[PDB]
Write an enzyme that holds these catalytic residues in place. Structure first.
Site, PDB file in Angstrom:
ATOM      1  N   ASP A 129       0.612  -1.087   0.346  1.00 16.52           N
ATOM      2  CA  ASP A 129      -0.173   0.009  -0.563  1.00 16.52           C
ATOM      3  C   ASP A 129       1.115   1.004  -0.164  1.00 16.52           C
ATOM      4  OD1 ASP A 129      -2.232   1.620  -0.582  1.00 16.52           O
ATOM      5  OD2 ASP A 129      -2.566   1.205   2.105  1.00 16.52           O
ATOM      6  N   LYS A 141      -1.209 -11.455  16.222  1.00 12.16           N
ATOM      7  CA  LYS A 141      -2.153 -12.244  16.917  1.00 12.16           C
ATOM      8  C   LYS A 141      -3.305 -11.463  16.869  1.00 12.16           C
ATOM      9  CE  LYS A 141       1.574 -13.777  20.342  1.00 12.16           C
ATOM     10  NZ  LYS A 141       1.752 -15.250  19.944  1.00 12.16           N
ATOM     11  N   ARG A 142      -3.630  -9.802  17.268  1.00 16.59           N
ATOM     12  CA  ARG A 142      -4.396  -8.939  17.155  1.00 16.59           C
ATOM     13  C   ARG A 142      -5.028  -8.896  15.699  1.00 16.59           C
ATOM     14  NH1 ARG A 142      -3.849  -9.595  21.947  1.00 16.59           N
ATOM     15  NH2 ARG A 142      -1.827  -8.310  23.152  1.00 16.59           N
ATOM     16  N   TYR A 143      -4.589  -9.451  14.550  1.00 13.90           N
ATOM     17  CA  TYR A 143      -5.182  -9.948  13.402  1.00 13.90           C
ATOM     18  C   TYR A 143      -5.159 -11.424  13.023  1.00 13.90           C
ATOM     19  CZ  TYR A 143      -5.989  -4.499  12.997  1.00 13.90           C
ATOM     20  OH  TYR A 143      -6.298  -3.393  13.668  1.00 13.90           O
ATOM     21  N   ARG A 144      -5.876 -11.387  13.507  1.00  9.66           N
ATOM     22  CA  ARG A 144      -6.274 -13.513  13.393  1.00  9.66           C
ATOM     23  C   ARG A 144      -6.733 -13.458  12.159  1.00  9.66           C
ATOM     24  NH1 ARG A 144      -2.071 -15.904  15.016  1.00  9.66           N
ATOM     25  NH2 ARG A 144      -2.816 -16.505  17.712  1.00  9.66           N
ATOM     26  N   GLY A 196      -9.472   9.354   6.514  1.00  5.90           N
ATOM     27  CA  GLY A 196      -8.964  10.334   6.112  1.00  5.90           C
ATOM     28  C   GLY A 196      -7.570  10.615   6.621  1.00  5.90           C
ATOM     29  N   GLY A 254      -2.254   7.066   4.108  1.00  6.02           N
ATOM     30  CA  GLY A 254      -1.331   7.869   3.442  1.00  6.02           C
ATOM     31  C   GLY A 254      -0.194   9.128   3.575  1.00  6.02           C
TER      32      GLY A 254
END
Ligand SMILES: COC(=O)Nc1ccc2c(c1)NC(=O)CC/C=C/C[C@H](NC(=O)/C=C/c1cc(Cl)ccc1-n1cnnn1)c1nc-2c[nH]1
Length: 238
Positions: free
Chosen positions: A93, A160-163, A186, A189
């Site tokens: 990204d 661990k926080r984003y299974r 908003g 970026g």
């Protein structure tokens, strides 16, 4: 920015506000000055942007109210999106805006140093996320640029926080376990700026999170050190 405070004029002079003109003019995303014709920002900002002709880069802005029809801006000559980019949640990204004219450096607008490849091992303890984004999920763009100090989180703890997600080493996370401070709508970026040996470095690009400032949901940033060669490829082309 959630749980942040008003910035002082000249505090984040690499911070820009990228506006779109279509259908009407409004703030689109944050960005960082990295070279005199270069803005580093997020690839997902250009979803549905068919041309660089609708874009306006404003530097040296503290308050969105400084922007009127007579306010000077930089036109965008080219939008360069990482060609492995598919979506914010899958990484890559990152995008560059090649400006139509040169930024004249001064105390109101100047570049932020990119991280050093040798400093991929340094531990940053003084990191700030900035932007004119929402203060909570259902809010509005803020007039005054906000700032919030946020700790970096290891890749292992962020995973661990984003299974259900794959948090790669090309991503870097930041947030308090209890939540309360984060980027929000908003802010993407914009920079995640870390001060090391009295020098500010562009450590991250605000990318995504599950909600804003939630407990155990760190903000996910593009890990800029992993893209230094890609940035040099695009900005130093012969
Ligand atoms: C009057 O002007 C306005 O209202 N402008 C105006 C108003 C709103 C928006 C735009 C323009 N920009 C876009 O839509 C461009 C296309 C961009 C998509 C995604 C972008 N995401 C973020 O900015 C940040 C996400 C984010 C990042 C971290 Cl690190 C943590 C939590 C996050 N959040 C999770 N849920 N919300 N935040 C976004 N930006 C907006 C909405 N969503």
């Amino acid at each position: 920015i959630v749980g942040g405070t008003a910035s002082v004029r000249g505090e984040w002079p690499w911070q820009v506000t990228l506006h779109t003109t279509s259908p009407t003019q409004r703030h689109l995303c944050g960005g960082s000055i990295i070279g005199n014709q270069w803005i580093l920002t997020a690839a997902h900002c250009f979803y549905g942007v068919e041309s660089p002709k609708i874009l306006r880069v404003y530097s040296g802005i503290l308050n969105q109210s400084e922007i009127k029809e007579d306010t000077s801006f930089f036109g965008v000559q080219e939008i360069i999106i990482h060609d492995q980019y598919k979506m914010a949640e899958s990484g890559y990204d990152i995008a560059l805006l090649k400006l139509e004219t040169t930024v004249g450096y001064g105390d109101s607008q100047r570049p932020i140093c990119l991280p050093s490849k040798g400093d991929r091992n340094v531990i940053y303890t003084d990191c700030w996320v900035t932007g004119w984004g929402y203060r909570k999920l259902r809010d509005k763009i803020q007039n005054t640029l906000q700032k919030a100090k946020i700790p970096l989180v290891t890749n292992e703890e962020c995973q661990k926080r984003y299974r259900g997600h794959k948090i790669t080493h090309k991503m870097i996370c930041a947030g308090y376990r209890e939540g309360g401070k984060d980027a929000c709508k908003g802010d993407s970026g914009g920079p995640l700026s870390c001060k090391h040996n009295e020098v500010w470095h562009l450590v991250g690009i605000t990318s995504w999170g599950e909600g804003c400032a939630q407990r155990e949901r760190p903000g996910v940033y593009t890990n800029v050190v992993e893209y230094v060669d890609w940035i040099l490829e695009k900005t130093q082309a012969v």
